[model samples]
Target: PNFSGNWKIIRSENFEELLKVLGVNVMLRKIAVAAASKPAVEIKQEGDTFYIKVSTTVRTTEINFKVGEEFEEQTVDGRPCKSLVKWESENKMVCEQKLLKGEGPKTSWTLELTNDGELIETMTADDVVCTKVFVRE
Candidate 1:
């Protein structure tokens, strides 16, 4: 499944729990939870490279990189991280992130495109799992 399309969030679950596990402050956690539930994501791909842009009421950011190559990311809540994205299957993509500055649990998220055309994003921080579902535009 080619994940090249603009997708809008349809549902979000347990985002607050995920943020708490990462030590995000209460104020930032609330903003993040709201943003997580309503962001619009755009994905584009060319051969081995991909570009992902996320837009929300609070902020907009972009990351473009080749699969399997390490990159840097300034997360929405302002944490710097070393990140990598790779394909786990023909229709599943996984992204991993480690803190660049402070001690924290390693994080990762999986994006799987379902037969019904829903994009399921499952994010993990330690034992916490947050899920967000999106539909293509």
Candidate 2:
């Protein structure tokens, strides 16, 4: 399915903990956890290609990747990682990220599109898992 819409985060769990494990500084996490504006996600698709944009209070990022391609990705905290994104099923997808340097660990995101038009993302790193849910607007 094409995830082409504007979304706002309605609920999040362990996201702050994920940031902690990923070595994000305390200051940044503070802003991310309690920002004046809510976070947002925008997913645009063209065939098997996708442009995933994420915006937090501190920064914004755009990830351009195809279903069967490996791309260089940088996390919001400035970790350079290599990612290979692929689809597991009609409504499920996964992106594997390998941290190239620093005190970072390998990470991955498993995403699913729910019947109620919700996007659920499971982020795993260093054996830690966090979940973020977004609703289309």
Candidate 3:
């Protein structure tokens, strides 16, 4: 799968609520929003494996994984924690993240590919859920 495109964070419904559940301060939330706009993600596939590079103005993160394979991941931005991402289905990604620094909590980011070829990314923490709709350019 090739994810070389321009993506935008159109909405963040329930994101603030999930942030509160994870004890993210208001200041951090504001900073996060400012830093996570229109992240550029490029993905390259090799057989059953894939490499993803996510770039933002403030930081960059990369991942190498295969479908149904789990690996260690570090959150270098946004939440700043250690996590794991697993591909549940074709174009559907799930992340299990646990805060190793600051307040400790477990959260999950579920990504679904919508019918319109956009990705519907959702984050669930405790009982709160936040979603980001991504459209390719």
Candidate 4:
């Protein structure tokens, strides 16, 4: 159940809608959707702390946090927020982000590892839900 590995995005659904719900600018959303290169997520876990890095053609972002602790987070789209990560099971974790700036709905994501080793990320913002599938690299 160790969630430490490099994963490459293989499929994404409703991702643009999620970005829209998160208040991402239309131009950036278009770039994200039209970029020829996809993204990769690298995770490193040490005891209670986890470090996550996401890389794409446009930008690379990373966050480090311990489970059950709230920490300041700057979203990929530049939203300042407070984030908390918690484990749902041995192979599943959830992240909840509360915006600290303007009015917005809370966003959350669930990361789960499938029996076949694929990683699934379910991101939710208000009524929008996006699913991204990844495979170990």
* Candidate 4 Cα outliers beyond 4 Å, as residue runs: 35-37
Question: Model 1, which residues run further than 4 Å from truth?
Answer: 75-77
lDDT digits (tens) for residues 1-137 of candidate 4: 66789998898899888778777789988997776147778999897698988877767788889999998877545678899988898888898888897767767888898988899999887788889899998
Rank by lDDT (best first): 1, 4, 2, 3
Model 2 TM-score (2 dp): 0.89
Clashes of each: 0, 0, 0, 0
Candidate 2: how large is its RMSD? Answer: 1.9
Name the lDDT value of residue 48 in candidate 4.
67
- lDDT per model, in order? 0.83, 0.82, 0.67, 0.82
Worst 10 residues of 2 by lDDT: 31-40
Which residue pairs in candidate 1 have backbone atoms (N, alpha carbon, C) closer than 3 angstroms, thus clashing?
none
Which pairs in model 2 have colliding backbones? none
Of the two candidates 1 and 2, the one with more favorable lDDT, higher being better, is: 1
Q: Candidate 2 lDDT, tens digit per residue, 36-101?
A: 147778899897899988887767888899888989888535688888988999988998887777
Candidate topping lDDT: 1
Off by over 4 Å in 3: 1-4, 75-87, 98-103
Residue-wise C-alpha lDDT for candidate 1, range 1-137, written one tens digit per residue = 77789999888888888778777889988887776667889999787688989987878889888889999886434678888888999888898888799766768888899999999999887787889899998
Off by over 4 Å in 2: none
After TM-score superposition, the amount by which residue 61's alpha carbon in candidate 2 deviates from its true location, in angstroms, is 0.3
Give one digit per residue, the lDDT tens place, for model 3 in 14-95: 6666666666788977776667766776656665576877776777788777656666566433555655667787667687
Better-scoring candidate (lDDT), 1 or 4: 1
Candidate 3, residue 43: Cα displacement in angstroms equals 3.0
